[PDB]
Amino acid sequence: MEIVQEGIAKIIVPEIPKTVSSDMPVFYNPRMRVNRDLAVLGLEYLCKKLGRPVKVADPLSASGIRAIRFLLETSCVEKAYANDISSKAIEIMKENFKLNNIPEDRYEIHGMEANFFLRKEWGFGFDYVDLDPFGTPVPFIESVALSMKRGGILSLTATDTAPLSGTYPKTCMRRYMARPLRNEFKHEVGIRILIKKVIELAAQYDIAMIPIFAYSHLHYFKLFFVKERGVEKVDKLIEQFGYIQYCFNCMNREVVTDLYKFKEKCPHCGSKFHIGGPLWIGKLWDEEFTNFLYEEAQKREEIEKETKRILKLIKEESQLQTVGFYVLSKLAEKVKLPAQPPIRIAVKFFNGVRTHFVGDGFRTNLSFEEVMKKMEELKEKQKEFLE
Amino acid sequence: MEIVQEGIAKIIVPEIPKTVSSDMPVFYNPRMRVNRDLAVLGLEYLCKKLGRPVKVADPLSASGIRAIRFLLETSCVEKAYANDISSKAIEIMKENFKLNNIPEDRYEIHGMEANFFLRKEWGFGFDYVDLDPFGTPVPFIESVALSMKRGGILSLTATDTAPLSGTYPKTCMRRYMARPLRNEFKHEVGIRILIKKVIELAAQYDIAMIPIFAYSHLHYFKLFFVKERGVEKVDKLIEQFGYIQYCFNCMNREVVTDLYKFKEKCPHCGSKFHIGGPLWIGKLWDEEFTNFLYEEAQKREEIEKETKRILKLIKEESQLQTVGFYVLSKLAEKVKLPAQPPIRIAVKFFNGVRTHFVGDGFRTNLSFEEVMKKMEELKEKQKEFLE
Numbered sequence: 001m002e003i004v005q006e007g008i009a010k011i012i013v014p015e016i017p018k019t020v021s022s023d024m025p026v027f028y029n030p031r032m033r034v035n036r037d038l039a040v041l042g043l044e045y046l047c048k049k050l051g052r053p054v055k056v057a058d059p060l061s062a063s064g065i066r067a068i069r070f071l072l073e074t075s076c077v078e079k080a081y082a083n084d085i086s087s088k089a090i091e092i093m094k095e096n097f098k099l100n101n102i103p104e105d106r107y108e109i110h111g112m113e114a115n116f117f118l119r120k121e122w123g124f125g126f127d128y129v130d131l132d133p134f135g136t137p138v139p140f141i142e143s144v145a146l147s148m149k150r151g152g153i154l155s156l157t158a159t160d161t162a163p164l165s166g167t168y169p170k171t172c173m174r175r176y177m178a179r180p181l182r183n184e185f186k187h188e189v190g191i192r193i194l195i196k197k198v199i200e201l202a203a204q205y206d207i208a209m210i211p212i213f214a215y216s217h218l219h220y221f222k223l224f225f226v227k228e229r230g231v232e233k234v235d236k237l238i239e240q241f242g243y244i245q246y247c248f249n250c251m252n253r254e255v256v257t258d259l260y261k262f263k264e265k266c267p268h269c270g271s272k273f274h275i276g277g278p279l280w281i282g283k284l285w286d287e288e289f290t291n292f293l294y295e296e297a298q299k300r301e302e303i304e305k306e307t308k309r310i311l312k313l314i315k316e317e318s319q320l321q322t323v324g325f326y327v328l329s330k331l332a333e334k335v336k337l338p339a340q341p342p343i344r345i346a347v348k349f350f351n352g353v354r355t356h357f358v359g360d361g362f363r364t365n366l367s368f369e370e371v372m373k374k375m376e377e378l379k380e381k382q383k384e385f386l387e
Numbered sequence: 388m389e390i391v392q393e394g395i396a397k398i399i400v401p402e403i404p405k406t407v408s409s410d411m412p413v414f415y416n417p418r419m420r421v422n423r424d425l426a427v428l429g430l431e432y433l434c435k436k437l438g439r440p441v442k443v444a445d446p447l448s449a450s451g452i453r454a455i456r457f458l459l460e461t462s463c464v465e466k467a468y469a470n471d472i473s474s475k476a477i478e479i480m481k482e483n484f485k486l487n488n489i490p491e492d493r494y495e496i497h498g499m500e501a502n503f504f505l506r507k508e509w510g511f512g513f514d515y516v517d518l519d520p521f522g523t524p525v526p527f528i529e530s531v532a533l534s535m536k537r538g539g540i541l542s543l544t545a546t547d548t549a550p551l552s553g554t555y556p557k558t559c560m561r562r563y564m565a566r567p568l569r570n571e572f573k574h575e576v577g578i579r580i581l582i583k584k585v586i587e588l589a590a591q592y593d594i595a596m597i598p599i600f601a602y603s604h605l606h607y608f609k610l611f612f613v614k615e616r617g618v619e620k621v622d623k624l625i626e627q628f629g630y631i632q633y634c635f636n637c638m639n640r641e642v643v644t645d646l647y648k649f650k651e652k653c654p655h656c657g658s659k660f661h662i663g664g665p666l667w668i669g670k671l672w673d674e675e676f677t678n679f680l681y682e683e684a685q686k687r688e689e690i691e692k693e694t695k696r697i698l699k700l701i702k703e704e705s706q707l708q709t710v711g712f713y714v715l716s717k718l719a720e721k722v723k724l725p726a727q728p729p730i731r732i733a734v735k736f737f738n739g740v741r742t743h744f745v746g747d748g749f750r751t752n753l754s755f756e757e758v759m760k761k762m763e764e765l766k767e768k769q770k771e772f773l774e
């Protein structure tokens with residue numbers, strides 16, 4: 001019904017409403033542009049890492065845009081294996097592959113259920129897999145992990161952020177076996193929960209799915225994993241499962257990996273100290289991988305400017321990684337700060353960095369008490385220099 | 388190589404070593420007789436419950452003994468679907484089905500990978516599924532749950548009892564995400580961990596796998612589940628996940644479902660209070676289901692005498708269900724009891740019942756302190772009446 005261009009690719013897709021949500025359940029969503037940009041860059045990383053032709057998988061292909069962009073915008077794709085259980089998805093995929101002048105022997109199209117497609121006896125493992133489902137990726141995790149080759153990378157997407165973010169706690173518990181926290185850094189909590197789920201599902205088969213990148217935007221999470229083998233690597237991941245105690249009254253938070261160490265009352269104001277998790281308390285970004293994404297993105301004109309700005313902010317953020325973060329407006333609302341300095345400036349007072357999660361959010365190695373102390377200080381010297 | 392008879396069935400199987408373990412990794416193991424007896428009785432229960440023809444599945448069939456015994460020893464089996472990825476397993480299966488004069492339209496034989504076999508578009512759900520793998524059943528749980536029909540029953544077996552029982556804690560953590568306890572009731576802890584794993588895997592799809600029967604013998608666990616639907620039923624199951632704090636010094640134990648309530652030191656002697664779980668702290672036996680198994684077993688001459696004795700002991704045990712149990716010899720060794728009365732008699736002093744888990748084990752509603760008090764009393768009045 002409509003032809004659109006994304007990057008180097010041209011595709012035929014059904015017409016799209018005047019406006020769409022970030023997680024719009026449609027055949028093709030242009031608002032997922034950044035997501036697909038990251039996927040392309042992620043594959044190019046693997047290309048530079050392996051230095052050889054790779055086989056990539058697109059189990060939930062829809063229009064086939066990702067597989068196509070992989071073939072056109074990267075250098076090492078030997079063959080792309082795209083799949084979709086939908087018939088017209090198949091038809092549209094066929095026509096899109098031909099529309100982009102892609103040689104037949106460069107790709108395969110399948111109309112199987114994702115898990116069947118992945119668990120096929122290929123005789124080889126996928127170097128790169130992009131899992132982009134409507135809602136939760138849980139039903140496909142195990143099949144993906146098993147189908148992937150050692151050292152391979154998983155490009156993952158999840159749009160069921162509502163349960164993960166604490167809006168639907170019971171739903172979150174059933175699917176991810178964890179208690180979410182609907183706070184100012186709820187999106188990070190959700191991501192860390194998703195990561196924990198992915199790791200434990202793969203851990204069942206002694207497969208180590210190491211998280212190397214995380215990105216949250218509106219109603220979708222974007223994750224990157226690298227598959228490794230060995231029970232010791234799985235163990236090292238499990239050791240990085242933990243809990244987050246959070247206080248809704250004063251926003252105090254602490255990481256707990258020892259079951260004996262839970263506190264009922266918030267040490268600061270004495271309010272209820274809620275428990276989030278279990279979840280991933282490790283690093284959200286691999287410095288090298290993130291840095292590559294940013295540098296490689298700057299070399300590509302077909303990469304969205306937004307993707308580049310996001311990658312710059314995430315690079316800055318990855319150099320000071322913490323569990324949870326602070327939101328300036330929430331802190332200021334707590335201490336009634338006379339004037340709120342721009343977040344770029346505000347972070348300096350806390351020796352911290354900006355976070356992509358929230359506009360006025362920031363990470364810092366300072367303790368909660370130290371942060372509040374900084375707020376009071378800034379508050380006092382602002383009132384003091386105001387006569 | 389050898390023909391053997393079990394129940395009403397006659398089968399051809401490769402010759403078996405003079406002696407075998409309970410979990411012997413062989414084509415056919417006669418030591419699993421009791422297990423298959425329970426499976427048959429379990430199916431007959433469903434027959435009496437539904438009152439209609441049912442479709443049963445045997446994803447890991449091997450010799451095809453289970454599917455055959457189902458067809459021959461129950462009344463409601465419409466069609467049996469047996470499967471095995473092994474070629475000679477297939478060949479042997481074919482010949483065994485024909486050997487027992489089973490009509491072709493009464494069964495189907497497949498040579499697919501279990502998950503593929505179960506996830507096939509059958510156009511119907513299985514009323515009864517028997518999962519009997521070498522080692523852990525984890526890799527098949529989700530496929531089984533999805534393939535089963537609402538109200539259907541799962542006949543499950545697990546031979547990886549070593550990790551579940553605490554012999555290999557790190558291995559247990561990777562596969563079941565839980566800390567085992569290598570104590571006197573380690574086998575119950577293992578079963579409860581397995582149950583928790585099964586429930587959470589099915590919970591991912593809003594499927595409620597309710598445990599209705601548990602049996603531990605040597606190096607294998609036997610479980611029965613009934614599939615139900617609705618998020619509320621899944622929630623009620625999740626609420627029954629918990630932890631077991633245990634003390635290796637004095638054998639004190641307590642159930643903890645509240646993360647805030649963990650104790651570092653054993654309240655009795657002050658030694659380290661270890662933590663087992665998370666795991667299933669609910670009932671291990673459905674009274675009605677268990678009672679049927681016992682009564683129906685007594686009507687069948689082709690059912691092992693051992694199976695009948697076990698079912699009688701388990702029926703007795705199911706009327707006083709607790710989390711964990713006590714072992715007389717261990718308690719006596721702690722207080723140095725002059726003479727140990729037979730377990731049948733000993734249980735009376737504690738107002739408890741015998742447990743199938745261990746010969747001299749027993750369950751009781753008395754608190755740990757009360758139990759030890761009983762031991763000292765019995766000890767004193769035994770020494771007192773001894774002049």
Ligand SMILES: C[S@@+](CC[C@H](N)C(=O)[O-])C[C@H]1O[C@@H](n2cnc3c(N)ncnc32)[C@H](O)[C@@H]1O
Pocket residue numbers: 027028029032036059060061062063064065066083084085086089112113114115132133134
């Ligand atoms: C969220 S869309 C992904 C679109 C595409 N990956 C992109 O980036 O634009 C997911 C697609 O997977 C297909 N799908 C959903 N469930 C599936 C399943 N169980 N097996 C195979 N394909 C499935 C649907 O038809 C849907 O079009």
Ligand SMILES: C[S@@+](CC[C@H](N)C(=O)[O-])C[C@H]1O[C@@H](n2cnc3c(N)ncnc32)[C@H](O)[C@@H]1O
Pocket residue numbers: 414415416419423446447448449450451452453470471472473476499500501502519520521
């Ligand atoms: C433990 S034996 C079960 C024997 C039989 N159920 C009984 O009670 O005597 C498991 C069988 O499943 C088969 N099997 C193992 N892995 C499989 C898989 N991934 N897919 C299909 N069959 C499998 C093996 O060939 C093996 O013979």
Ligand SMILES: [Zn+2]
Pocket residue numbers: 247248249250251252266267268269270271
């Ligand atoms: Zn507080």
Ligand SMILES: [Zn+2]
Pocket residue numbers: 634635636637638639653654655656657658
């Ligand atoms: Zn103690």
